[PDB]
Amino acid sequence: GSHMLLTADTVLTGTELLRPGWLEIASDRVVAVGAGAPPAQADRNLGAATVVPGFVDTHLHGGGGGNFSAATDDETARAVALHRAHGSTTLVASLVTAGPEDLLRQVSGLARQVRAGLIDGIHLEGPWLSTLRCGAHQPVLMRDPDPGEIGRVLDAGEGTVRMVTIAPERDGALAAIAQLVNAGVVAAVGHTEATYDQTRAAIDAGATVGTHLFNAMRPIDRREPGPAVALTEDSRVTVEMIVDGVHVAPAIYRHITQTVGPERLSLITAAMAATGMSDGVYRLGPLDIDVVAGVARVAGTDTIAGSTATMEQVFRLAVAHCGLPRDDALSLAVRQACVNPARALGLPAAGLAAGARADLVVLDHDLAVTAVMRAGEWVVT
Amino acid sequence: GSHMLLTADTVLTGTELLRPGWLEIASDRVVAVGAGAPPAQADRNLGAATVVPGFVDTHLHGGGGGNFSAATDDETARAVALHRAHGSTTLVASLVTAGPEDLLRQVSGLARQVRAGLIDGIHLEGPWLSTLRCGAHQPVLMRDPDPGEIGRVLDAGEGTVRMVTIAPERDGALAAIAQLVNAGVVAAVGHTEATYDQTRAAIDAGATVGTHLFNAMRPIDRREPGPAVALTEDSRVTVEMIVDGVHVAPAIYRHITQTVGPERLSLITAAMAATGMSDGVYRLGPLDIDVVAGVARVAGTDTIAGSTATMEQVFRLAVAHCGLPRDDALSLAVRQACVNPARALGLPAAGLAAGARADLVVLDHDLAVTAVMRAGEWVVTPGAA
Numbered sequence A: 001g002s003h004m005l006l007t008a009d010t011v012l013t014g015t016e017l018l019r020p021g022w023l024e025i026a027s028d029r030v031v032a033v034g035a036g037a038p039p040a041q042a043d044r045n046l047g048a049a050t051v052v053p054g055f056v057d058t059h060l061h062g063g064g065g066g067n068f069s070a071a072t073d074d075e076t077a078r079a080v081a082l083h084r085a086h087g088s089t090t091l092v093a094s095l096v097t098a099g100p101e102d103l104l105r106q107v108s109g110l111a112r113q114v115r116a117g118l119i120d121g122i123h124l125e126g127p128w129l130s131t132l133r134c135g136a137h138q139p140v141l142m143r144d145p146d147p148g149e150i151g152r153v154l155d156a157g158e159g160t161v162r163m164v165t166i167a168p169e170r171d172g173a174l175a176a177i178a179q180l181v182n183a184g185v186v187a188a189v190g191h192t193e194a195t196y197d198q199t200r201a202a203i204d205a206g207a208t209v210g211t212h213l214f215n216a217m218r219p220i221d222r223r224e225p226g227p228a229v230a231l232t233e234d235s236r237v238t239v240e241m242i243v244d245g246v247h248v249a250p251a252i253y254r255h256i257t258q259t260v261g262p263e264r265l266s267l268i269t270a271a272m273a274a275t276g277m278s279d280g281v282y283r284l285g286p287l288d289i290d291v292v293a294g295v296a297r298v299a300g301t302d303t304i305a306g307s308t309a310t311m312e313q314v315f316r317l318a319v320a321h322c323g324l325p326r327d328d329a330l331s332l333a334v335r336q337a338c339v340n341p342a343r344a345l346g347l348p349a350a351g352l353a354a355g356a357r358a359d360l361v362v363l364d365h366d367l368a369v370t371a372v373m374r375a376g377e378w379v380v381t
Numbered sequence B: 001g002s003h004m005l006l007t008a009d010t011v012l013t014g015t016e017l018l019r020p021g022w023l024e025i026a027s028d029r030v031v032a033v034g035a036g037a038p039p040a041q042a043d044r045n046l047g048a049a050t051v052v053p054g055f056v057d058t059h060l061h062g063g064g065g066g067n068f069s070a071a072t073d074d075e076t077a078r079a080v081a082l083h084r085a086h087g088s089t090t091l092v093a094s095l096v097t098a099g100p101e102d103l104l105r106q107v108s109g110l111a112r113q114v115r116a117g118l119i120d121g122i123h124l125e126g127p128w129l130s131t132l133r134c135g136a137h138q139p140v141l142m143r144d145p146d147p148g149e150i151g152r153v154l155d156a157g158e159g160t161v162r163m164v165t166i167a168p169e170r171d172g173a174l175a176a177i178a179q180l181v182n183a184g185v186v187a188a189v190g191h192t193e194a195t196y197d198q199t200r201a202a203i204d205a206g207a208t209v210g211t212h213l214f215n216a217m218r219p220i221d222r223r224e225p226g227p228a229v230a231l232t233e234d235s236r237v238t239v240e241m242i243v244d245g246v247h248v249a250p251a252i253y254r255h256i257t258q259t260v261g262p263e264r265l266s267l268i269t270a271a272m273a274a275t276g277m278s279d280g281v282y283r284l285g286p287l288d289i290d291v292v293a294g295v296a297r298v299a300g301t302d303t304i305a306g307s308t309a310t311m312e313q314v315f316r317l318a319v320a321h322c323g324l325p326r327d328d329a330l331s332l333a334v335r336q337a338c339v340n341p342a343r344a345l346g347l348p349a350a351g352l353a354a355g356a357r358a359d360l361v362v363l364d365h366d367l368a369v370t371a372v373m374r375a376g377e378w379v380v381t382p383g384a385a
């Protein structure tokens, strides 16, 4: 654009709650943001709306019928369009376990769409995972992390692979974590039967993210705490959680938030390709997924295979279920849905502040998305 | 009575860490506490020792060969003498699940020792329980909480029953919790297969304590969190934890401390009658117990017969495993072993402060007890441990 001055009764910047607030947008940047009456006459008076920074979804597999694992322009476009429509202005595309050949093709294909700007990075969830915690993955393809293949895969992405999930109990997992962190890649722990001690070792080797805490993860036990306690204990780790109301009980979300504090939890969707569509049978990598009432299940089991949630939905549920008063709930959920995930992944600092890119979301009273701006242009006007 | 002046390199009062510190004792009361040099020449300089308030053990079954469930002067005296020598200056004696007539006799007999001053209260850990997990005491006598029997048992205690463990899923549990709170008794949640929702209902009905969190309790599951999460979530609840290194992993104790904060965890021993006994085989109530390297087992079996922890041991393990630097660790451990449990049970607020009873413990640099004072007199005088 050129000159936009927005007002709204509430503006959350990432670190403060402005009531009322205003933002001045020039081209694709925020030039200025503040509380009270605006420094000039406003162009857009949003009224009784809440403005938050754009949502930063760092772990999702598709949407609107599109699968990121397809690594085609059409499927990526329809996934990006749906999530962007719901306020996810930054997206890390996740790949499920795959054979070496398909992995290179998928990484190369997605890396092109990063460079094109459709997605902001690649997450490799697999193949270096535990077969005991596979879920919606093909366990046959999981393998020990080999430093030759890791280098080949990172070479193919040309710096666009941002995060790799590792099962810390596989042979060569601790070397692979060091190898990833030397390449500037975030090492995440997930899909693992690791003990407390093995997860603690992975953290000391440089893992800094917990992949959807409590899902595909050994449970907490009084004598063997398991990975979830190692991950919540260490302040260097940002834990992911899927708060769609299906993957973990809301009281678990509340418990972990209590434990790790406001800066150490990231909300994610793990959205699959049926997000935004109708019910039926779908595809995730090389698997068939039956979505019944929006609940994704691997065809023929009881295993939930991913969510059908957008960041707008998990934001709303975080606010409702975090147990804090409304204003504090909004502030917390903005840290979890915008600030913490961008920080954890080395992404452009989320936040509405002078010089930041103008990515923001307008929420109505019920906290539904009414507008979405990305790079200073309305995606949803 | 005259004023005794004590000095030590470090005095923890329950809220402050004084370095150096001093305390003035008159009769059985603390007169004054302060930092720096004493007001006069001290009657005893404890030197390079750390003084803490007396330990408050709110859940234990015996020690030194005595079972509180015996409800005799001889068994209670032996248990009290053992734990007192390791710094527990306040004790709440626990009874396991028992038959209705045996329950009344045990309560009646322990109430007399409350009135005599050997113990400070009674905890009924049973019979209104409902778990078969390891830790179950006598599950064939577990039964629904009948308000008639509760009134009869509370009457028998003449106000000395301070805590009652309730499994929240039994018919009548929520009513029993309301009945206990109205009678001024603490309702604890424990020995239960209750869901998260059923436990949160018990908390809304007035339960304020979790009986040895994670032990004898449904575990945490991602879709059914179980009672431990309801108990850690609610600020009204003080959770018990047995930190002897065996009942819960040290990192679980850190996790829970990190979750609930410094005010909401109590260290307990759940000590059984073999606590503090030398290696050997012993007749303790209805069981032959074999003690090997301080671990008690029923003779002829590999099965561990419960905790043999003293408050001295759990305090030292709490300081070692809480993951804080030493001074912050001592300050947390004093809250968990002294202030939080006394407050949860409505006991005389622990702490070395003007007006408080003179109950304190002297520890060396290894955090071993070297002296114990209770009501202004040395139970264990410095050097005699």
Ligand SMILES: CC(=O)N[C@@H]1[C@@H](O)[C@H](O)[C@@H](COP(=O)(O)O)O[C@@H]1O
Pocket (backbone or CB within 6 Å): A096, A134, A135, A136, A137, A212, A214, A215, A216, A217, A247, A270, A303, A304, A305, A306, A307, B222
């Ligand atoms: C793509 C993928 O792997 N998604 C996982 C799924 O595998 C797992 O079954 C589910 C719950 O796992 P849980 O039953 O251990 O919580 O979480 C995620 O949806």
Ligand SMILES: [Cl-]
Pocket (backbone or CB within 6 Å): A212, A270, A305, A306
């Ligand atoms: Cl997932």
Ligand SMILES: [Cl-]
Pocket (backbone or CB within 6 Å): B212, B270
């Ligand atoms: Cl016990």
Ligand SMILES: [Zn+2]
Pocket (backbone or CB within 6 Å): A059, A060, A061, A094, A125, A270
């Ligand atoms: Zn995933």
Ligand SMILES: [Zn+2]
Pocket (backbone or CB within 6 Å): B059, B060, B061, B094, B125, B270
């Ligand atoms: Zn007990």
